Design a binder for these strands. Sequence first.
RNA 1: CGGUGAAAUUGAACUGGCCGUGAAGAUGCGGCCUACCCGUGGCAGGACGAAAAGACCCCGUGGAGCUUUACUGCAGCCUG
RNA 2: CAGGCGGUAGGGGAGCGUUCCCGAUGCCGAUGAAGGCCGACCCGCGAGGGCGGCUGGAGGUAAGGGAAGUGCGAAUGCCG
RNA 3: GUGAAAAGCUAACCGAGCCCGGAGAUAGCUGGUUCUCCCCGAAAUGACUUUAGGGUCAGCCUCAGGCGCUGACUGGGGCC
RNA 4: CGAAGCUGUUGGGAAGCAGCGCCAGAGAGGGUGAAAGCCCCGUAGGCGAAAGGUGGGGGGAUAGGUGAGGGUACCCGAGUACCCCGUGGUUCGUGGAGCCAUGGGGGAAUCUGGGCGGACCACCGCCUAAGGCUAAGUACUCCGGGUGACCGAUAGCGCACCAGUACCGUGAGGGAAAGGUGAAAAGAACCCCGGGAGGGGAGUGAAAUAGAGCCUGAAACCGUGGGCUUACAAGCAGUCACGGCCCCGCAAGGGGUUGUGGCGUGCCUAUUGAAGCAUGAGCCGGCGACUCACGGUCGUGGGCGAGCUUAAGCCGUUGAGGCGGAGGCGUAGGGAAACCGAGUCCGAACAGGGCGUCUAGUCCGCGGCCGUGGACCCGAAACCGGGCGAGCUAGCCCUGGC
RNA 5: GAGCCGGUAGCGGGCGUGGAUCCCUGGAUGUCCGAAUGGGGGAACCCGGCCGGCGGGAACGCCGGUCACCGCGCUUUUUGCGCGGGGGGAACCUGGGGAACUGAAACAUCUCAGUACCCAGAGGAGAGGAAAGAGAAAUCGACUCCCUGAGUAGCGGCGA
Lengths: 146, 94, 103, 63
Amino acid sequence: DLRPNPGANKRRKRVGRGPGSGHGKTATRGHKGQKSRSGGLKDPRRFEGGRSTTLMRLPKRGMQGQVPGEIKRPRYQGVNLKDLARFEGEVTPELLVRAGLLKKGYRLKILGEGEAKPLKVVAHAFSKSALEKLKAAGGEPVLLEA
Amino acid sequence: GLAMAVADRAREGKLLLVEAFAGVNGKTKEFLAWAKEAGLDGSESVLLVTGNELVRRAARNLPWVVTLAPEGLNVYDIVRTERLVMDLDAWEVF
Amino acid sequence: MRVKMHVKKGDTVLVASGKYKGRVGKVKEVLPKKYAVIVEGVNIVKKAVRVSPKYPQGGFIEKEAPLHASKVRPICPACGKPTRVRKKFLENGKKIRVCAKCG
Amino acid sequence: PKMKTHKGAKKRVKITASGKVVAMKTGKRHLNWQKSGKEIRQKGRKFVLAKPEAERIKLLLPY
RNA sequence: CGGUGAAAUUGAACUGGCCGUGAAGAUGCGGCCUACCCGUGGCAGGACGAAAAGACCCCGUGGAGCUUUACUGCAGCCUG
RNA sequence: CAGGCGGUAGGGGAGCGUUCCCGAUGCCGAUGAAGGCCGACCCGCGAGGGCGGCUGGAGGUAAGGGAAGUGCGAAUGCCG
RNA sequence: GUGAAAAGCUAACCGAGCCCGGAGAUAGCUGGUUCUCCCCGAAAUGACUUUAGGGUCAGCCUCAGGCGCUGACUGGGGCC
RNA sequence: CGAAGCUGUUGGGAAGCAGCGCCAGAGAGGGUGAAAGCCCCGUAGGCGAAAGGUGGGGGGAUAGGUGAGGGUACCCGAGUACCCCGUGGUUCGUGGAGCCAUGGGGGAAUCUGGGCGGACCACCGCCUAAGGCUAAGUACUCCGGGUGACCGAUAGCGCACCAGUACCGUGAGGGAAAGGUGAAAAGAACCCCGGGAGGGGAGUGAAAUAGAGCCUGAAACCGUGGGCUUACAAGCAGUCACGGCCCCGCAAGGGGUUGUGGCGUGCCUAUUGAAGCAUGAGCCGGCGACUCACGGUCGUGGGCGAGCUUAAGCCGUUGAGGCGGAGGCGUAGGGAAACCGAGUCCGAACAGGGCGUCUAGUCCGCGGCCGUGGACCCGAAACCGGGCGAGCUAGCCCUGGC
RNA sequence: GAGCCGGUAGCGGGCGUGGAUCCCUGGAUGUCCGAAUGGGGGAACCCGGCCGGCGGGAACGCCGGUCACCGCGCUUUUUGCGCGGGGGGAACCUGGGGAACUGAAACAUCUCAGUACCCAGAGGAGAGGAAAGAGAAAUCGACUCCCUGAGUAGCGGCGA
């Protein structure tokens, strides 16, 4: 093309800053009667509180904070139809998940809400909803067991 | 980017044999000899992609002009220029 | 930098860089590139001495360094100095030529 | 850099979808009242009406 | 009187006084009172004068020390 | 056309002045870049911008926007 | 460390020597700002703070989306 | 090794220009008497390195390492593990804390044996401690290089000038200032001032407001000398006003200054509260303070857009590129968890009750706004470590003296 | 390739067309100080055993010499070689020793930090290193550097 004064595309502003100056509002800060500007000025991460920040609470959810490990269990993955009633050819994960979108799921669970073409698709565990939408009006398979 | 850009830069006078001769493909002058026998002369600037060392180790000092070969893309400098030529649509990139 | 410029007298050749006319060589060093060959008229007024022709005020000179000259080869213009394969001297030589094997 | 979010806070609270700073409170911790009488029972969860904002943040990497 | 020639301090000035007024002890502000220009060598009354960023003092969840039957340990004595 | 307009901190609108980028194998440039002393015209509310004279002695960087160790009376600051 | 004793002396200063660095130690400690201009222009309060010339949330000054006659000021009208 | 015109007229001088001729896998850069491809040094490139010697790959490679199974049938890294205490490391500060080295005593066993899957028993799994050697892909800098939106000589490097010197110290220690005539010194000839010093002329000299604390040379501080002011006189002093009083415009006026009259409490930092003898203010110049990394997080032009985004490499990049899917947010929630589901959790509960749904999102630069960062600017007496330390003061210690 | 006498700079006198000027690689030189190492020794100043060599008588001084060093291997009993090695080096290694300020808006666990920093061998590298592994998977298959995992698990007056 050229360099036809290619400014910009409307809104941006590098709105830099600067040291001191005597123009407009330049020179000031905003505070006072509130000491806190230090060499390592607070930070400032939330800080303050001056009232434990209402942290008089306490934890009850006891099931973690143990030590070495956490809870180990193969993936837990359900679903919904109104996502890809589109293609099927053969509704089976990997072909999905492993494609389009969605991540790992050792054991397969299925639901959502919307409708679709009751066609057999991997089912390492499904919901009654689908049953009817894939029984006397559909197709469903079986799980792992290996 | 360059899509919409050159389109209008075609209203300028793009073209691009996609691969053209000139002669010894190693002797500068003669290359330009196809510059004139084509219709160009140092003024409105242009560029091009020649994936071959051939015209590279040739085009040497390409003022007002391109003299590429490999692939990096230099639209900008084309801004200060105009017309141009290509090495197969494939060379650009599928 | 480095020590690489010209050679010796013979004829060398004066030119017009603001002087004009052409003459033979004399002497030349490379360090700063300075040297001499008569022509260039410049006079360095001496000090309160006397031993020499007398007290102060100097005399004739020369002065230059970089490029700004040529060589001898009458009528037509001048060229360089090629090599040797099976001619005169072995496979060496070169003494400022016209464009054949002379000057 | 980095900012390794804080476990404890996360050991309890949660942002119910709506971005609401909601979680448990403090009270019926096994009576700590005594009096066979009656009351304790009362318990539940609650937002925060001005701090909540703040909190959610130190947990933008951990979720 | 010839000769050689600093200083700490260093906003700036064309710096009276009274009676009075303004952060409550002004030439610098009133109003009223005087005061031709530059000198010299004198007492410093003030110039809250210098230079010292109060050290008594209160200030710092600021500092250093000694010591107790503070609270915690090193010691080394001790005790199986 | 009603309106608004003092206004510390704060919080918006820009604009301005201030050093590298390509443009720079483009363009002024010794009938001068650059410093400047001067300017009592013009343009800028300002920011400044100019804009031309005399001293001035070797380079500059267009529109544009792209990057910012500056937009410094001072802190008994550093230094000279 | 020494110390015919104060707590003194140790490169004139010594209740803890100095070179050199561990760090901008640190720090609610003290002092700093230069372009133009242009819009609202508030707290010196409440709660809780080993908190009190510090701080959380609040409220009166900021910007944007949105809603909008309903708002601030007003007669009466119930009803305190 | 290399690549290819000049020319006159003017111009100090010509890298000024026209008319045009030119090599150009080579118009990088340094440059030679004023803004130079064809001009000194180079830059495509491809020649080749040694005698000296000399760092090693490829090649070859030498001594030094390389079959299978079947039953007999005894045999293998000890004060060693495993106990133990005090343990350190491990994210592991005692804790339900194994395993690593354990300092202390105990204290075996060697394959139908022996360690770990984090307590004591029982199933199952990969390994075999108490010998030591081991490249590659890893870090690094005084310089060599390059380059480097690297600084560009009150910089930067302390430092481009004979500094780690003058210097201050006792040691340790600590630390300065100080670049710039010019194209060429061509560096001043000569003769009257004359103490050498320091002068005037002249000359060179494109240039002596060009000559040696000389580049160009401002600013505080200097009066020659000029012009407007002044000895009745009261003031942050400057202003505004008619007036007069010397340059410039035919004119219109433009000026400079000031008489008097009026008018006048400054300035930078603090706070119910200022001008204020509450602080600071030598004076002029000159240096001076929140980026930015990374990290978090609201907006903005955007594109893709249930979909929307790949590090670390590898070819390649003058340059550039890049090819190169492991890593995110959503595409749901909610629930201690088990795990249920547009819905979840309490509850015996169809019910009650607080957290659910066209939730377009997503990554750019810019920016808010934060996290480490010292992240604004320097600074307070000290605490830690190591070095210097009694060529002074001490006490005794050796011996000379008075 | 035909200019040199370091630069700075001469008075003063000298070399290359048998080929200098100058960058070079092997190697002949190099006092005492310099771990310095016959010995002393506020280095850089200072006395020796012993053989041969000079002047010279012996000497004295001149010379050469050769003579600390420990250790493992060597070398019989004090015998003799060999190396190593003290010492050296901008970061980057290994190890052994190992703080306090600061945070925690006090403070004693915790923090900084195994950081600063001392001492320790070696290499350009170094350190490391080949499963008595990982871990759950009909599994993987030495060790080092980066990719994330993951700022997750967890550690924690579960406080920072």
